Design a protein around this ligand. Structure first.
Ligand SMILES: Nc1ncnc2c1ncn2[C@@H]1O[C@H](COP(=O)(O)OP(=O)(O)O)[C@@H](O)[C@H]1O
Length: 249
């Protein structure tokens, strides 16, 4: 279960997403009053593990909506017409369960400029065309490779708003570290230091660092968590050791 309080370092990105969906949904009345149709799709982009799915999930909680997630790669099918059918069913289901947030991760797998997948693409855009705003089912897509995308994905009525979800900067990381260490008791711990030593980390790495910290404490049998635990969790999660593994698997 996810809420805005489970998210760190993305204050303006959240506001933007909220302004694009939460705001209209609540007071749609008041948008037509100004001549602006509420967006149908929002595209989130940036490197992996930095909060894109989190924002979409938490947004879904806050508007009390069904949250349906599909990974783009799985809409690529060996057999003809299947990719398109799935997208069709996806949208039917999302109506069945309205209101809903559809979250299509790795939308690049389908929205790249073999030709079957373009069929699959046409279907989705077809689906957005025809949904009609004001507006009960909303789509959120995510990619780490945005520059790839067919611009027909981005025309108005389709993935209008773009929001970059970056690697966390120094303060972001601090915020994120707090989110995932809020429910531990630490004593020796300076998190500014941890934030300083993790340049380039993602939100996920940082969660992993807090997680590896607490278990390090456990394996050395204490009940609290200390700076040393974090210094080695930082060294475990980041750094060659897990690096080579990745090059290895
Ligand atoms: N901005 C963030 N704030 C708090 N936790 C985060 C953040 N970004 C990533 N995480 C942690 O990493 C995990 C993956 O985040 P997710 O939103 O799935 O990343 P992606 O951008 O790959 O969709 C989440 O479960 C979350 O706990």
């Amino acid at each position: 279960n996810v809420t805005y309080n489970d998210i760190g370092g993305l204050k303006k990105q959240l506001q933007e997403l909220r302004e694009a969906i939460e705001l209209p949904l609540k007071h749609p009345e008041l948008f037509e009053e100004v001549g602006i149709d509420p967006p149908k799709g929002v595209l989130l982009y940036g490197p992996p593990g930095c909060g894109k799915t989190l924002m979409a999930k938490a947004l879904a909680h806050e508007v009390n909506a069904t949250f349906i997630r599909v990974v783009g790669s799985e809409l690529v099918r060996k057999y003809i017409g299947e990719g398109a059918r799935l997208v069709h069913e996806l949208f039917e289901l999302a109506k069945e369960k309205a209101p809903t947030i559809i979250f299509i991760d790795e939308i690049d797998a389908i929205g790249a400029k073999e030709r079957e997948v373009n069929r699959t693409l046409m279907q989705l855009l077809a689906e957005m065309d025809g949904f009609d705003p004001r507006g009960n089912v909303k789509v959120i897509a995510a990619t780490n490779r945005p520059d790839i995308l067919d611009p027909a994905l981005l025309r108005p009525g389709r993935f209008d708003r773009l929001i970059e979800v970056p690697l966390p900067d120094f303060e972001g990381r601090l915020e994120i570290l707090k989110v995932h260490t809020r429910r531990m008791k630490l004593k020796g711990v300076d998190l500014r230091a941890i934030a300083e030593m993790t340049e380039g980390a993602s939100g996920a790495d940082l969660k992993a660092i807090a997680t590896e910290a607490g278990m390090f404490a456990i394996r050395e049998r204490r009940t609290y968590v200390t700076q040393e635990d974090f210094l080695k969790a930082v060294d475990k999660v980041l750094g060659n050791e897990r690096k080579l593994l990745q090059q290895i698997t």
